[PDB]
Structures are given as C-alpha cells and as structure tokens.
Amino acid sequence: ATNRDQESSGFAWWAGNARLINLSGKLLGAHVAHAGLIVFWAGAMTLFELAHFIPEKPMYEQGLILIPHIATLGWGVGPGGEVVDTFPFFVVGVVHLISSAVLGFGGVYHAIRGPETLEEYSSFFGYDWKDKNKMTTILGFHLIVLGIGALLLVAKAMFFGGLYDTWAPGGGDVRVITNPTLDPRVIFGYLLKSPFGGEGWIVSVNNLEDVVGGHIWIGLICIAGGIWHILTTPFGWARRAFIWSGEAYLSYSLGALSMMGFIATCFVWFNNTVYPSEFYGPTGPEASQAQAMTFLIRDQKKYLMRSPTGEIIFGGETMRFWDFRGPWLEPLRGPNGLDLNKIKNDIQPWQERRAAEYMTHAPLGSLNSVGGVATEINSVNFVSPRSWLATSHFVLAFFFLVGHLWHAGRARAAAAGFEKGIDRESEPVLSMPSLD
Amino acid sequence: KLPEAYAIFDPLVDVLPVIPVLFLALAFVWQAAVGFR
Amino acid sequence: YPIFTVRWVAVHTLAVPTIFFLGAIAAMQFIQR
Amino acid sequence: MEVNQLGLIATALFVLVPSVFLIILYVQTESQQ
Amino acid sequence: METITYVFIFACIIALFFFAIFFREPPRIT
Amino acid sequence: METLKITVYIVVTFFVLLFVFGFLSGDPARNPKRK
Amino acid sequence: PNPNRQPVELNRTSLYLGLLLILVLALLFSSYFFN
Amino acid sequence: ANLWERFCNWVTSTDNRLYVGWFGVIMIPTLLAATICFVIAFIAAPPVDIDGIREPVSGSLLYGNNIITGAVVPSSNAIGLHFYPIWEAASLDEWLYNGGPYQLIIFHFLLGASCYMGRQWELSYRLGMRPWICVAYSAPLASAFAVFLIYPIGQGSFSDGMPLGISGTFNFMIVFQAEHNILMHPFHQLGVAGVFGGALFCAMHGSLVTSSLIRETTETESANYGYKFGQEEETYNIVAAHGYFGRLIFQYASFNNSRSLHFFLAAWPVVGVWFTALGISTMAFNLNGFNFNHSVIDAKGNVINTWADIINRANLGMEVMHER
Amino acid sequence: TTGERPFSDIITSVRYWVIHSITIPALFIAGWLFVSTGLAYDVFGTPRPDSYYAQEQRSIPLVTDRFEAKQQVETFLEQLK
Amino acid sequence: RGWFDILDDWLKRDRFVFVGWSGILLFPCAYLALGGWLTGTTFVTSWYTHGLASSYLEGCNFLTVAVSTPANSMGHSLLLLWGPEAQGDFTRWCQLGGLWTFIALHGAFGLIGFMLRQFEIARLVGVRPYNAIAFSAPIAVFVSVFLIYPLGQSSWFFAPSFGVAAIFRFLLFFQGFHNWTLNPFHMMGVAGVLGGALLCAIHGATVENTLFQDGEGASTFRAFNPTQAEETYSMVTANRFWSQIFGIAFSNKRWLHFFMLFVPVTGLWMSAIGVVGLALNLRSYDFISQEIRAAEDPEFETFYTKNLLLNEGIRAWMAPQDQPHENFVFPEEVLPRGNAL
Ligand code: CLA
Ligand code: CLA
Ligand code: CLA
Ligand code: CLA
Ligand code: CLA
Ligand SMILES: CCCCCCCCCCCCCCCC(=O)OC[C@H](COP(=O)(O)OC[C@@H](O)CO)OC(=O)CCCCCCCCCCCCCCC
Ligand SMILES: CC1=C(/C=C/C(C)=C/C=C/C(C)=C/C=C/C=C(C)/C=C/C=C(C)/C=C/C2=C(C)CCCC2(C)C)C(C)(C)CCC1
Ligand SMILES: CC1=C(/C=C/C(C)=C/C=C/C(C)=C/C=C/C=C(C)/C=C/C=C(C)/C=C/C2=C(C)CCCC2(C)C)C(C)(C)CCC1
Ligand SMILES: CC1=C(/C=C/C(C)=C/C=C/C(C)=C/C=C/C=C(C)/C=C/C=C(C)/C=C/C2=C(C)CCCC2(C)C)C(C)(C)CCC1
Ligand SMILES: CCCCCCCCCCCCCCCC(=O)O
Ligand SMILES: [Cl-]
Ligand SMILES: [Fe+2]
C-alpha cells in the first residue's frame, strides 16, 4: 500500500488521484481505464439509441446525439437524411463496446497488477515530468496519432463512401468529396475571420470541400509537428516560459479543452453543415427563418425588410437572423437577398416540407423535456439535440476553464514552493516595504 | 430497433449507458472499505 | 448506556412519522390518476 | 422633469448633516494628543 | 438640478474612493 | 472613421504585445521564494 | 468637575466608511426624494 | 539595464501602491475605457432604438431619467450579434442611435474583468500566496459573461443582453422569467441557495467570531482595538465558539477546524453562483426551467390548477406585454 | 462525550438491526394502508380525483363566509354526493 | 434544593441535544411547525381556499406542494381548531386553511424559542450573544412577511403559502402589484444579501489562500490544531494582497468579522421595513415626474415605463386565478397585450 494513504503521500482521499503523479505505471492504468470508460459510453449509448430508434421518424425528434454523428459520416443514410439501413450504427456500437472491454482490461492490469513505475522496466515508456525531451517525444507520438485520425476522416470522405452533404442539390445526399480545398488562403482565412455576427469564424464553414481540405491540412500539420517534436528539444524561450511539471501540462490541456468545448458549443448551435439539420434538427436561426418563410407562403396564397447594409431579408424580429444560410433557402436567395418572385414561382415541395417541419421544431424546451414556449402546456415532448449538446458542452467548458485556473495556479505555486502555505519564518510580505 | 436476434438482450442494453456512473460510485465504495485513509 | 434518553426521543419523533409518511407517499406513487 | 423641489434640500441635508457630524468627530480626534 | 445632484453625489463618491485608497491611515505591524 | 480604426488597432496591438512579451520575459522566475 | 466625561474618537477609516454610507444612501434615496 | 528590464521590473513590482502586472497592463486601459464610456453614456447618451423598429428607449440622465431608471440601453436588434465598433457606423449619431456604447462598454468590461481575475492570480504569485482567490472570483465573472455575452449569443442578439442600469436589470429579470421560467430552474434555485446560504454563513461566522472575542479592552473603548495588525496570537477563542455552536445544533454539526470552516465559507456561495451562471447560459440555449403545467388532472379530465399554473399565468402576462 | 452510546456503535450492532427489521416495515405498511385504503382522504378532507367537481357544475367550491364556511364545505360535499 | 433548582440543573445538563429552559418553548413549537408543513404538503388540499391542488396526495411534487393560506373570507382569524370557524372538527380545520395559521404561529414561537436558546447557550458557555443579535434579522423578515404583511392586507390569504412554487408566486405577485424591485428598502436588502455572499466567498478564499505552512502534507486541513494560539493564516499578507488588488483591505480582524455580521443583518432589516410599508400598500410603485412626462409625451420610453407595462400584464393575467374570491371576469379585449400598445 505504498503512497495509498495520507501520511506517506500527503494527499487526502478526495485528492487521492494526486497520489498518482509520480507513479507512471498506475497513472497509465488510470488513463487506459478511463479511455475504456469513454469508449464504453460511446458503444453503450449508441446501442441504447439504436434500441430506441424509429428509422422512419427524424432523429432529432427522438433525442439522439450519437446516431446523428454516425449519419453525418455517410453511414446508413440516403438522400434527404433518410435511414436506408441501421446496421452500421450497430457495428459502431458493438465494436466500441468490445474495444472498451479490451481497454478496461489493460487499465485494470496496469493500475492493479503491473509495475508501479515504468522507469526501471522500460527506458522508452518510463518518463519523468521534468524531462522535457521525453515529454516532447510523447507529445510528438500523440500528434502523429491525431494527424492519422484527421486523415482517417479525409479517407472516409474521399474514398470510403463519402460524407453526408446537406448542400447537395435536391435536399442533401451522401456524396464523395473529390475536390477538397487545398488552398491555404481559404483554409487559414477561416482562421482569420471575426467570431462575431455575419462572420462566425471557423463555425461558418458551409461546404464539405473546405472541411475535407482543412482536415488534410490539419493531419499534415499534426504529423509534421509530431515529427518536429520527436526530433527536437524545447528551445530556451520555451524552457523559460513554461512550468515543466505534470500538473502544469494538465493545466495547459485543461485550458485547451475549455476553449475547444466553447468552440464545439458554438459549432453545434450555429453550423448546419457538419451538424446537418436533417439529423440534428434546425438551428435557432434556421427555425426562425423557416417560420418567416412558411408564414410568407401562407399569407401570399408576412413582411420583408432592408437590413443595415442593404440586403433583402425577412422582416420582423427574425431580422436578427438574417445571416442564416440553409440548403432549403439558398435556391430562393438572389443577388440582393430573398428574391420574392422566385419564392412565388420557383418554390419546390421539398423546400416547403423542410420549412414547415423546421417551423414545428424550434430549439426551445424545458428540463423535463416539454416543447414550445415556457408558458405553454405539456402536450409536446421536444428539446432539440442542439440545445442538449450546446448546454452540456458550455457547462463542461466552463468547469474545465475553472479546472485550468486551479491547476495552473497550483502548478505555479508548487514549482515556486509555496503551495502548502506561507513559511512562518520567511514570510515574503514582511520583508517587503510598506505601501504607505 | 436492434436486430431481432439481439432483442432478448434489449433490457440489458437499457441499463448499459448508466454503468460508467456506477464506476464513480464504486470508487467511493472502495474508499469506504479502506476507511478513507 | 441508557436507551430512553433525550436523543432517543428526538430521533424517534423525527423517525417514526418519517417512515409512516414515506409509506404513504409510495402508496401515493401507485395511485391510478 | 416635474420633481418635488424639496427633494433638493432633502438630499442636501441628507448629505450634509450626518457627514458634517462625522467630519467634526474626525477632526477633533486628530487634534487630540 | 436633479441631474446635477446625481452627478455631484457620484463625483463625491469617486473623490472619496481616491482619498480612501491613496490617503488612508497606513496599517502598521505590531 | 478609418483614422480612429487605425489608432485603436495600433493601441490594442501595442498593449497585447506588451502582455505577450511580458509573460515571455522570465515570468516564472518572478516569485519571492525559489527564483 | 464631572468625572464621567470621556473623550470621543473617530478614526479616518470610520470617517471614510461613514461618508461612503451617507453618500451611497443619498445616491439611492435622492431619486425617491425628487420622485 | 535596458528599458525593457526596467519596464518589466516596474510592471511586476510589489512595491507599487496598486499592483499592475501584465494582466493589469491589459486591465487598466480596458476598464478605464469602459468606465469613462459608461459614465458618459449614463449621463448623456441619446435614445437607442433597441428593437430596430424606430421606437428609441431613452436611458441617460439628461433625457429624463434618474439614478434608478437610468441605463445604458443594449445595442439594436438590427445589429444582432454583429461587431459594432465606432468605425463600423456611418456617423457617430448612427452609432449612438443603434446602441454602440453598450457593445463598447461590455466588451471592454468583460476583457478587463477577465484580466482582473488573472491579476488576482498574478499578485498571489508575487506575494508567495496560494493562488485560488481568482477561482472564487470566477463565479461573479461567469455571471457577468452569462448575462452580457452568453445569453446574447444563444438568443442571437446583443439586444437581449442585460442593460447597464437598475430598472433595465429588473426588465431583464422579468422578461427572462417570462421566456424561460427561471424560478423553476434548479440551477437558479441552487444560486438562490448559494446567495442565501452565503449571507447566512457570513452572518453566522461573523457572529460566532464576534461572540468569542478575547477580553483585551475596557467597556469605554471599542473591542476592535483589542486586535493589533499583524499580531501572532489569535484574537478570538475558537474552542469557545465551537462549544457554543455545537450546543446550538449538535456537536457533529460544528467545525472544530478553522481551515475546513473557511473552505466551506468559500465553497458554498461560489459553487451556487457557478450553477446560477450556468443556468443563465443553458437557458440562453433555451433549456428552460420545469414547466409542470396541467400536472394535476381529475377523473373527468378537468385541469386542477397548482401554484405552478399561477406562475405560468403570470409568465404569460409578462410574455404578452414584452412583445411588440 | 455526553455519556451516550455513539450512533456508529448502534447502527453497526446486531440487536439494533434486529429491532429495526420489524418496526420500520410495520410503520411503512401503516402509512401504505393509510393511503391505499383511502383513510387519508377522509381524515384530511382532500378530494378524491372524481370529487373535485360536482356532476352538474364546474365551479370551484370556495368558501365565502367566515362563520358559515363549515356549513359551506358540508354543502359542497353534499352536492357532490 | 427546591424543585426549580433541580429542574434547572436537569434542563441545562450536557447531552447530545441541549434542552434548556428555552427548549420547552422551542422543541414543541418547532416540531409542530415542521410536522404541520410535512402533513399539509403530504395530505392537505387547497381546493376550498384557493381552488388549487397542493399536496402529494393530489399528485403534486416537491416543487409544487404547499400549505396554502386560508381563504380571504376568513379575514385575519386565528383559525384555532376549537375556534368558531372549525368548531373542533379537524377535517374542516384542514380544509379551511387552519394548518397555515398553525404553522405560522408555531413557527413564530419556535423562532422566539430558538433565539432564547441562543441567549441561554451563550450565557452558559460564556460568550457574547451576538448570534442572537444576528438571528434578529431572520425573525424580522418572518414577522414582517408572514405576520405584518397579511395583517396590513385584507386577510391571511395574501401572506406567502408555505411552499416552493407558492413562494415563487409571492415573488411574482410583489413584482406585479407592488413593484417591489423599485423599492429602495428591498434594494438595500438585495445589497445586504449579495454583499454577505460576496463577503463569505472572499473571506473564505482569502483565509484559505493566505494559510501558514503548518504541516508537511499537501492537504492543508490537517495542519490546524483547534487549541493552537497562533493565527492559522497571515493577516499581513492578506491585507497587502487586497490593498494592492482592490485599493483597500481589512487590517482589523475583529472589525472584519463584525462587518460580516453587519452587512446581511442590516440588509434583512431594511427589507423587513420595506415589507411593512407594502403591508399598508405604501409602495415605491412609481416616480411621479416620469408618470407626468409619459402622460404628456407618447414617445417617452424608459425601462421603468416598460416595467410598469409588464406589471400591468402580470396583474391582469394572474388576478382571476390568484384571487378567485374576487370573481374577476376579465374579457379578452380588456387584457393588456403588447400588440395593442
Ligand atoms: C476514472 C476514474 C478513476 C480511475 C481510473 C482511478 C484509478 C486509480 N486510483 Mg482513484 N479515485 C477516483 C477515480 C478513479 N481512480 C475517485 C473518483 C476517487 C475519489 C473517491 C478516487 C480516489 C482514490 C484514492 C484515495 C486513491 C486512488 C488510487 C488509484 C490508483 C490505484 C487503484 C488501486 O490500487 O485501487 C485498488 C482497488 C481495488 C483492487 C478494488 C477493485 C477495483 C477494480 C479495478 C475495479 C474494476 C471493475 C471493472 C468492472 C473491471 C473490468 C475488467 C474487465 C474489463 C475484464 C488507480 C490508478 C490510489 C493511488 O493513487 O495509488 C497510489 C489511492 O490511494 N484513487
Ligand atoms: C482531465 C481533467 C482533469 C484531471 C486529470 C484532473 C486531475 C486532478 N485534479 Mg482536477 N479538476 C478538473 C479536471 C481534472 N483534474 C476540473 C475540470 C476541475 C474544476 C471543477 C478540477 C478541480 C479540482 C480541484 C478543486 C482539485 C483537483 C485535484 C486534482 C488531483 C486529484 C483529483 C482527485 O483525486 O479527485 C478525486 C475525485 C473526486 C473526489 C470526485 C469529485 C466528484 C465531482 C466533483 C462531482 C461529479 C458530479 C457528476 C458529474 C454528476 C453526478 C454523479 C452522480 C454519481 C452523483 C488530480 C491531479 C485536487 C488537487 O489539486 O490535488 C493536487 C483538488 O483539490 N481538481
Ligand atoms: C496507452 C496505451 C498503452 C501503453 C502506453 C502501454 C504500455 C505498456 N504496456 Mg500495455 N496494454 C494496453 C495499453 C497500453 N500499454 C492495453 C489496452 C492492454 C490490454 C490489451 C495492455 C496490456 C498489457 C500487458 C498484458 C502488458 C503490457 C505491458 C506494457 C509495457 C511494455 C509493452 C511493450 O514492451 O510493448 C512493446 C510494443 C508492442 C508489443 C507493440 C504493440 C503494438 C500495438 C498492440 C498495436 C496497436 C495498433 C493501434 C495503435 C491500435 C489503436 C487502439 C486505440 C485507437 C485505442 C508498457 C509500459 C507489459 C508490462 O507491463 O511489462 C511488465 C505487459 O505484460 N500491456
Ligand atoms: C497538441 C499540440 C501541440 C503542443 C502542445 C505543442 C507544444 C509546444 N510547441 Mg508545438 N507544434 C505543433 C503542436 C503542438 N506543439 C504542431 C502541430 C506544429 C506544426 C505546425 C508545431 C510546431 C512548433 C514549432 C515550430 C515550435 C513549437 C514549439 C512548441 C513549444 C513551445 C510552445 C509555445 O510557447 O507556443 C505557444 C504559442 C505561441 C507563442 C503563439 C503566439 C500566441 C498567439 C498570439 C495566440 C493566438 C491564438 C488565439 C488564442 C486565437 C486562436 C485562433 C488563432 C488561430 C487566430 C511547446 C512544447 C516551439 C519549440 O520550443 O520547439 C521545440 C517551436 O519553435 N511547435
Ligand atoms: C411550547 C408549547 C406550545 C405553545 C407556545 C403553543 C402555542 C399555540 N398553540 Mg399549540 N400545541 C402544543 C404546544 C404549544 N402550542 C402541543 C404540544 C400540541 C399538541 C397537543 C399543540 C397543539 C395545538 C393545536 C391543535 C392548536 C394549537 C394552537 C396554538 C396557538 C393558540 C393556542 C391558544 O389560544 O391557547 C391558549 C391557551 C393558553 C395560552 C394556556 C394558558 C394557561 C394559563 C396560563 C393557565 C390558566 C388556565 C386555567 C388553569 C384553566 C381553566 C379553564 C377554565 C376557566 C375553563 C398558539 C400559538 C392552535 C393554533 O395554532 O391555531 C391555528 C390550534 O388549533 N396547538
Ligand atoms: C486598479 C485596481 C482597481 C481599483 C478599484 C478601486 C475600488 C475602490 C474601493 C472602495 C474604496 C472606498 C472605501 C471607503 C471605506 C474605507 O476606506 O474602508 C477601509 C476599511 C479598512 O478597514 P480596517 O480593518 O483597516 O479598519 C478597522 C477599523 O478602523 C474600523 O473602523 O475597509 C473596510 O472596512 C472594508 C469594508 C468596506 C468596503 C467598501 C467597498 C464598497 C465599494 C463601492 C461601493 C459604493 C459604490 C457606489 C457607486 C457610485
Ligand atoms: C482502477 C480503479 C478504478 C477504475 C476502474 C475502471 C475505470 C475500469 C474500467 C472498466 C471498463 C472500461 C470495463 C468495460 C467492460 C466491458 C465489457 C466486459 C463488455 C462486454 C461486452 C459484451 C459482452 C457485449 C455484449 C453484446 C454485444 C455482442 C452486442 C449486443 C448487445 C450485448 C451487450 C448483449 C476505480 C474507479 C473503480 C477505483 C479504484 C481502481
Ligand atoms: C479542420 C477544419 C478546418 C481547418 C482548421 C485549421 C487549419 C485549424 C488550425 C488552427 C490553429 C493553427 C490553431 C492555433 C491555435 C493557437 C493557440 C490557441 C495559441 C495559444 C497560445 C498560448 C496559450 C500562449 C500563451 C502564452 C502567452 C500569451 C504569453 C507567454 C506565456 C504563454 C506561453 C503561456 C477549417 C476551419 C478550414 C474547415 C473545417 C474543418
Ligand atoms: C399538524 C398537526 C399535528 C402534528 C403532526 C406532526 C407533528 C406530524 C409530523 C410529521 C412528520 C415528522 C413527517 C415526516 C415526513 C418526512 C418525509 C416525507 C421525508 C422525506 C424525505 C425525503 C424525500 C428525502 C430527501 C433527500 C434529501 C433532502 C437530501 C438527500 C437526497 C434525498 C432526495 C434522498 C398534531 C397531530 C400534533 C395536532 C393537529 C395538527
Ligand atoms: C478617447 C477615446 C474615444 C474616441 C472616440 C472618437 C470618435 C471619433 C468620431 C469621428 C467620426 C468622423 C467621421 C468622418 C468620416 C468617416 O470616415 O466616416
Ligand atoms: Cl419589456
Ligand atoms: Fe474568519
């Protein structure tokens, strides 16, 4: 029971995982068992969702968040988001469950039975947190693995059946991307766009060619950076800029993950390309514009406005959602805005069906899963999957920002040596001159 | 729905996603066995 | 170690109606509505 | 605006009378030694 | 005179902030 | 409007560069205990 | 002479706190005094 | 030394009356800009067409407002979530009319308050302190982000952000209750538990420490003079306070550890306010509070109202009046 | 402290669980029979799900007089009967 | 020794739960208030007083159960079980709202007993009774809201009903009818509560982050001894930190803890004073100058005028169901709507 009590380790039970900081084998076991937990949730949740999936009904009307992820990859779906077969969903769930059993076995072995420290057993797997070269080597290996994953998404898009394109003409279809955007100007212009209204930063990616080209760039960049970090040591500015300890690296990862969680919240709220409205449901702007367009064709068989910069837009409060772009609306949008005569005599039945269906499913609901306004009776059970994903990931991103602050401060204090409190005989403020 | 041959194990699937949460609880149970040392 | 203490009285005046009420509320959970 | 005019003197007295009081006490504290 | 009164009280509060920060009685150890 | 935009961009760039290069100028060394 | 008389004290911190209380109360209640 | 080392030593100096630091070299200009713009807008800003329907709302003192009713009106609904600096408007009149000052103030304030949190960490590092005061400050900062940034992002317009005024804040509260039923949201209930418990435990801790002060004075002088700044001995008997509080409820409900007690004092309102800020953000993505309308039906199908139905009636009354 | 046997000793004792393996089910079944037999509706005057409204009317039976509210409640209970 | 002295020694004997002389008032009254609330929320309806279901037996949950106030026609009757309204019948007593007055009166005397318990324990332990002084503020809130406010109004009906959603209704009622947010006494109450929460968080975090290293463990909680004479945290370092961060800082620990006492207690007392004003409908509903300006100028619109419109909407849409004794029949055309404004 070495380092498994407060007296030897210095950490209480509620900080008991902090006893794993200098125990590489048990730390690896904790990580592998946790990865097994993640893959287990993926497999089990996919099997649960499939067990409760009605393929005829839309996915967003049944509270699914994992089946839409597989469907966006072009697996088991056809034109218009229709589910041609459900077997690949089952395959994904089962393979994840089995792989999670394997990872759980490895995690339990390394945490319980295997060597407590990996340093004496293997020079390659043994690591010290202060060894900057070994940290950069492990970071390089993981960067190569991440680049391979991005290229796996690319390979799925170009060769293994393609991806679901909601922007495909006729109402969206599974399409093989043959011409990805390799031009660095477009790809990094997405990085250089403003995050505000009408611009939307990388969330405003609106075609799969840009998505696949950006993933080609990301995979190549990650592989190159992985090779670079295997081959090199940190420079002097890097060594003087950072704290080099396990808690410090954890805090850096926590800050990165918090930022990524906020970005994913905005992606699932605004983007309808990598989160198609066929599976995930309409966005809030999408539902409002669908309401305006449907009531317009109702009243013509609504109102129009002029916008701050002079474009023909839907009138009303939905003037705030004039930057919305959707596959069912772009055929109607002309050079100066929504071409009204082109609404009158170019409207297609699939566009009207999409607009009415997206009218009825605005992303508004309650915690007890009651749809509609908060002042309305409980006759409709619909909270949008976009709402669930955005809310949950904002909560997680904020708490991970808090964790980043906690661990970054603690890492700095522990590196400087006052994380346990102020030394009574060497209190720094006493040596400092008084402010006045 | 699941494929039909798996349908007899439909209740088990209905409890599968909750299993990681119990893992968290298990840690406290384990600590309760060791007196929270 | 006596049994009929002040602590026993406080615990049981909070405990006996608690179980009575819990049984009542469970029987309420099986009301047909 | 058509306010109550007395509000002005009210506000002024509400500022002046207590604050002056404190100032008096403070100044006579500083002159003691 | 209403706006004048509000701005005057606010300015007095800001001046009091200045005097409370930079002209405080200094805390002395022991 | 454009002169104001350039002025604000210059001011913001100056302060942000001050922040970034100040935190790169041996900031972990500036504690009272170990360095 | 009366032997029950004692000196009265108000430190500068109490002066600042009392001035803050009076001025903030005046800022709060002035709109209602004007009405 | 060169100018850069002298500047770095001045910036990170603990001998400055107010600490600057690098977070402070961002914090001071942004907060000064936000403060100056707020004071000027609160006194003298022209009316703002917040709904973009040519019906401007007057918020400044010069246009017929007092301290209570004055506000900096949020930017126009026609602006939405668009970035609206001064140079993006054709004129200063157009920028003022569309609520540009609100955007300037809130962006500068959010940046300055984030750097205030960073500056709190920075000074704690320079003084050899433990670093987690900034973690406690992250709860009101999260609340400010929720009401000024996250709720506009979820609803799609900075016109739905909280106005910078007292009556505007009340308007924000009432419209929020109308649209989201925040009172029936458990995150807001956790926030209310956080603030009520924080006030309770603040009064409790203050009264227990004041109750057990050690006699060092006479009846003719204030007891606060019994404490010397920087004295080594404790100024109150924590054992006597623990004995009192243990006899008040029972012995196991009383903290004998002052460090555990002060951690609890930090943790309760901070966690509660974290949850209420997250509640505001999650209702920004329209995940609203519990509905419970028509939850009791008789045998014949007639709805039997509850208190939740009265709440929903009030919410509908607010809803029909805040629209158009 | 205070001369009472600690709760940790009692809840880990065999005899405490022997006593409380009978009394607690008896109280639980007492509450269940209080609700399920319908005695609670009669004791507290809470209307049954078919007893909110009279068969002919759809008016809420509010009491309107201070000193005849008892007779008013009884009249409502008669007209639903 | 005399029966009084022997009883006094028995009542103040050290045990797990202190009894004292105040226990004779506190324990029965607090037990009866809590038990009455649980009984009412579990079994007792509000059908005859409010036209509402408010018990678990009717199908409500924890958020929506309440012991509701008596009917408005009861007036300010004590509604005793043996009184002229219930005439000894427990069932009619429950149906008429007698449980509300039971809980309110027993809770009031229980709060009196708890404050006397604070005084008694402070006397025997030997500490100053500042906890009782601080507890005067919750008592002031309870007396102003649950007793003084309905006594100033028409009946017990308009007091808060003892429940979660019923309290939420009480909040919305005060907004719609009193404009209680505009009241400066409520504003000082809000400042007191939020400042108390801020003081709690800031003082706890400051103490936890200025601790002296008194132990070798990385968990600092075990580095404290209750009987130690030294301070466990550095007041000098905390003062320096807050002086350089905020401009000002506490330098006197005794003044700090008195201030922590003072802020929420004063806030709650101010809010109680405002609630007394609302008991007589003496509210800060409006500013007369802005009313005149809005009457003479149809284009004048501030957030205060929008709040007045929202209050009018609350009143007209909630009054027929929240006040069913008045028999309010509001046709659709008289209900205020934004699209007719
Ligand atoms: C994702 C969650 C997670 C993971 C992976 C770990 C992992 C670990 N913790 Mg830990 N912990 C956690 C959450 C977690 N913890 C939480 C939430 C708390 C707070 C209560 C703690 C508190 C805590 C303390 C206080 C300590 C640890 C310690 C440890 C390490 C040694 C474990 C040991 O010897 O236990 C032995 C326990 C057992 C043998 C009991 C059985 C446990 C097995 C592994 C369960 C397996 C079940 C599963 C179904 C098996 C599937 C197999 C199948 C695939 C074939 C280990 C790496 C210790 C440490 O740091 O060591 C130095 C230590 O002292 N933890
Ligand atoms: C990848 C993420 C990550 C990792 C690896 C760590 C790792 C660590 N953290 Mg950390 N932390 C994180 C994220 C992370 N943290 C985040 C996001 C926050 C902000 C909330 C924190 C806040 C935090 C604090 C405040 C502290 C740590 C500490 C620690 C150390 C010991 C942890 C331990 O034993 O916990 C044991 C685990 C528990 C006691 C369980 C906690 C239960 C959680 C809070 C509630 C879960 C609710 C759940 C989602 C829903 C309900 C479940 C249901 C069953 C009821 C360890 C190095 C400690 C430290 O500094 O040690 C050096 C410490 O004091 N962490
Ligand atoms: C993060 C993952 C990870 C890491 C770093 C390690 C690291 C280690 N393991 Mg371990 N292990 C893991 C996961 C991991 N394991 C899992 C999941 C299991 C369950 C199957 C095991 C089961 C296991 C056993 C039973 C033993 C080890 C041992 C060892 C040590 C020596 C291994 C060696 O010499 O490899 C040399 C290199 C190889 C054998 C080549 C491996 C090639 C792999 C299998 C191909 C994988 C392809 C691809 C990456 C798969 C992606 C999966 C991913 C997406 C989830 C070393 C410290 C041994 C030990 O502790 O020594 C005393 C030992 O006896 N491991
Ligand atoms: C998981 C990813 C990861 C991580 C953790 C690291 C970690 C590291 N890299 Mg690195 N790297 C990576 C991937 C990664 N790399 C990849 C994929 C590549 C290939 C492009 C490189 C190429 C690379 C080079 C060429 C160098 C490093 C270096 C370093 C070290 C110093 C880090 C530093 O100060 O930069 C912190 C970041 C900055 C100083 C950039 C300025 C900060 C700007 C202003 C922030 C702007 C972002 C803002 C928040 C908005 C976001 C959107 C934006 C795109 C507009 C550190 C060990 C250096 C080193 O020491 O080499 C050994 C070095 O010279 N890396
Ligand atoms: C700490 C003890 C305590 C206190 C202070 C109260 C206080 C109260 N109870 Mg209460 N109660 C208690 C314990 C207590 N109760 C217990 C233990 C029970 C359970 C049996 C009850 C059950 C109960 C019910 C069922 C009801 C009350 C009610 C009341 C209220 C009005 C009672 C009244 O008018 O009596 C006045 C009587 C006295 C003050 C006694 C004075 C005795 C004098 C000093 C001695 C002289 C009397 C003389 C000897 C008798 C001669 C009579 C002869 C001439 C005919 C009041 C707030 C009523 C209520 O809340 O209505 C809403 C109600 O209906 N109580
Ligand atoms: C660059 C960093 C940013 C700088 C921010 C500057 C913030 C200024 C803080 C307030 C200074 C004035 C304090 C006077 C009072 C003063 O000088 O007090 C100083 C005093 C020092 O206490 P000691 O312990 O030294 O006093 C012990 C005995 O002498 C008791 O009398 O501190 C306190 O009592 C703190 C509690 C009151 C804290 C008051 C905060 C109120 C904030 C503002 C509220 C009104 C706003 C109205 C808006 C119109
Ligand atoms: C270290 C540690 C820990 C942790 C642990 C862990 C975290 C683990 C993991 C684990 C895991 C992660 C596991 C997993 C498992 C799994 C399994 C074992 C599975 C299997 C599967 C199967 C058998 C399948 C089946 C089927 C199919 C085929 C399909 C259809 C459906 C069904 C389901 C029927 C804790 C915290 C406690 C604390 C202390 C120590
Ligand atoms: C896939 C995709 C794509 C692409 C993308 C990309 C291309 C990306 C990249 C990205 C990137 C490329 C990023 C980057 C980032 C960075 C960062 C985020 C940074 C950070 C930094 C830091 C953190 C620092 C800090 C500091 C300071 C400030 C000072 C001194 C100290 C220190 C060092 C701490 C697109 C959209 C087209 C389309 C869709 C899909
Ligand atoms: C009124 C009246 C009376 C009285 C009575 C009494 C005194 C009663 C009692 C009663 C009682 C004494 C009852 C109890 C109840 C209880 C219950 C019903 C409970 C519940 C619970 C629960 C449900 C739990 C919860 C929880 C918590 C809070 C935390 C954690 C989590 C959970 C959720 C588990 C007399 C006859 C004298 C006279 C006439 C009138
Ligand atoms: C000190 C900070 C405040 C700065 C505010 C500056 C406002 C300047 C407004 C100038 C508008 C002049 C427009 C000229 C023509 C144009 O280019 O649009
Ligand atoms: Cl409004
Ligand atoms: Fe304290």
JSON list of C-alpha atoms in Angstrom, two decimals, chain G residues 13 17 21 25 28-29 31-32 34-35, chain J residues 182 184 187-188 255 284 286-289:
[
{"chain": "G", "resi": 13, "resn": "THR", "atom": "CA", "xyz": [-11.29, 54.62, 8.39]},
{"chain": "G", "resi": 17, "resn": "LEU", "atom": "CA", "xyz": [-16.89, 54.29, 5.93]},
{"chain": "G", "resi": 21, "resn": "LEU", "atom": "CA", "xyz": [-22.61, 55.04, 3.81]},
{"chain": "G", "resi": 25, "resn": "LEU", "atom": "CA", "xyz": [-27.68, 56.23, 0.83]},
{"chain": "G", "resi": 28, "resn": "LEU", "atom": "CA", "xyz": [-30.07, 55.65, -3.55]},
{"chain": "G", "resi": 29, "resn": "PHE", "atom": "CA", "xyz": [-32.75, 57.83, -1.95]},
{"chain": "G", "resi": 31, "resn": "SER", "atom": "CA", "xyz": [-34.43, 59.73, -6.89]},
{"chain": "G", "resi": 32, "resn": "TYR", "atom": "CA", "xyz": [-37.21, 58.95, -4.41]},
{"chain": "G", "resi": 34, "resn": "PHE", "atom": "CA", "xyz": [-37.19, 64.06, -6.07]},
{"chain": "G", "resi": 35, "resn": "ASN", "atom": "CA", "xyz": [-39.81, 61.49, -7.23]},
{"chain": "J", "resi": 182, "resn": "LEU", "atom": "CA", "xyz": [-38.23, 49.52, -7.35]},
{"chain": "J", "resi": 184, "resn": "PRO", "atom": "CA", "xyz": [-35.12, 51.15, -2.05]},
{"chain": "J", "resi": 187, "resn": "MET", "atom": "CA", "xyz": [-32.63, 47.35, -2.82]},
{"chain": "J", "resi": 188, "resn": "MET", "atom": "CA", "xyz": [-30.74, 47.59, 0.47]},
{"chain": "J", "resi": 255, "resn": "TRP", "atom": "CA", "xyz": [-13.78, 44.71, 12.51]},
{"chain": "J", "resi": 284, "resn": "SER", "atom": "CA", "xyz": [-42.43, 52.80, -4.33]},
{"chain": "J", "resi": 286, "resn": "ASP", "atom": "CA", "xyz": [-43.86, 54.93, -9.50]},
{"chain": "J", "resi": 287, "resn": "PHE", "atom": "CA", "xyz": [-41.90, 58.12, -9.99]},
{"chain": "J", "resi": 288, "resn": "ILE", "atom": "CA", "xyz": [-44.40, 60.96, -10.36]},
{"chain": "J", "resi": 289, "resn": "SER", "atom": "CA", "xyz": [-42.18, 63.07, -12.65]}
]
